[PDB]
Amino acid sequence: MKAGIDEAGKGCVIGPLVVAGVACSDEDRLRKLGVKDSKKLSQGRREELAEEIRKICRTEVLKVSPENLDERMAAKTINEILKECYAEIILRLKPEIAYVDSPDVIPERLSRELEEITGLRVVAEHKADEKYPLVAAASIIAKVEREREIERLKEKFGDFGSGYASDPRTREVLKEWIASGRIPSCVRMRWKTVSNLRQK
């Protein structure tokens, strides 16, 4: 079959990196679920859509915790760590051709390095979920998995916002946490935002 791979949370300061792959025997059946315009859906509707996808397609999810992200980022960039996860998922699914989202606008390099690593056919593109149903589906699975984790974390540490440096709420909560000198484990320490916040 063919497969789509994508991720959720690459740019967050809080929470895990989630990478998912989706492989379907009936791509038309996948399209009927409306994966193409899944972006307008709510967290609840998207979660239901994720379940429908798992019912008709093989799915593989990989999660990297903040702790592990911090460990690996000493020797690698986040994008390379992503490529690592991508190849792992592609190797689980062993598809005929794998379509993957490219962090960089220019995809050629990632495609090469991935084909080199996997020894499989790989087509990468920036914002691939907006061009390939399989990728749109993989994107949905990753987001839902990420959100489930985020919600789990909020029950424990309170509402820290979305987890991205954008959210005013996230930055505010992030500042007090650092100030207290007792930062929750879900915060990515090797993240620029955090570094800068601590430096001052």
From Swiss-Prot:
Cofactor dependence is on:
Mn(2+); Mg(2+)
Quote the catalytic activity from the record: Endonucleolytic cleavage to 5'-phosphomonoester
A GO MF annotation of the entry reads: RNA-DNA hybrid ribonuclease activity
The record lists a divalent metal cation as bound by: D6, E7, D101
Cofactor descriptive note: Manganese or magnesium. Binds 1 divalent metal ion per monomer in the absence of substrate. May bind a second metal ion after substrate binding.
Family annotation (Pfam families): RNase_HII
> What enzyme category does the UniProt record give?
hydrolase
Give the GO terms filed under biological process for this record: DNA replication, removal of RNA primer; mismatch repair
Effect on the protein upon substituting R146A? Decrease of activity. Increases Km for RNA 26-fold
Instruction: Give its E.C. classification number.
Output: 3.1.26.4
Q: Record's superkingdom?
A: Archaea
Location of the RNase H type-2 domain: 1-200
Naming one, the record's GO cellular component terms include: cytoplasm
Give the family, as the similarity comment puts it: Belongs to the RNase HII family.
Functional description taken from the UniProt entry = Endonuclease that specifically degrades the RNA of RNA-DNA hybrids.
Know the name of this protein?
Answer: Ribonuclease HII
